[PDB]
Amino acid sequence: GKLTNGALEASNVDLSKELVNMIVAQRNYQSNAQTIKTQDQILNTLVNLR
Amino acid sequence: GKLTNGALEASNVDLSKELVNMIVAQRNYQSNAQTIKTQDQILNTLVNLR
């Protein structure tokens, strides 16, 4: 491509696009963390069974 | 061209052509500036959504 004497390039980031992905990723992290509790409790019941 | 003597060139600027360009340029400026307000008031929603 061609150059342009006196210009810069912007930084490619849409802020309104990035501020909604964090809302999805935080709930993703929380729903993943909510599986360790289920696993831990089904282990603890098998330990305190006998 | 011809070298006419005893006479000078004028400015070629038509005043009634320039006094109505200001009206449409000021309306264009105001319509461009009202886009910053609606871009800001939709980012003010997403920064308070959480």
Features:
part of a larger assembly; 2 chains; 50 residues; mainly alpha; 1 helix; 0% strand; Flagellar hook protein FlgE (chains A, B)
Describe the protein's architecture and organization.
- Chain A contains one helix and no strands.
- By secondary structure, chain A is an all-alpha fold.
- Chain A is 70% helix and 0% strand.
- Chain A has one helix at residues 15-49.
- Chain A binds chain B through residues 15-16, 19-20, 23, and chain B through 42-43, 46-47, 49-50.
Please state roughly what percent of the residues of chain A sit in beta strands, choosing from under 5%, 5-15%, 15-25%, 25-35%, 35-45% or over 45%.
under 5%
Category from helices, strands and their pairing of chain A:
mainly alpha
What separation lies between the terminal Cα atoms of chain A? 74 Å
Can you summarize the main beta sheet of chain A?
A: none
> Helical element count of chain A?
1
Compute the number of strand runs of chain A.
0
Classify the helix fraction of chain A into a percent range. over 70%
Order of helices and strands of chain A: H
Which chains share the greatest interface? A-B, 5 and 6 residues
> Mind telling me the C-alpha Rg of chain A?
24 Å
Specify the oligomeric state.
Answer: part of a larger assembly
> What is the overall silhouette of chain A?
rod-shaped
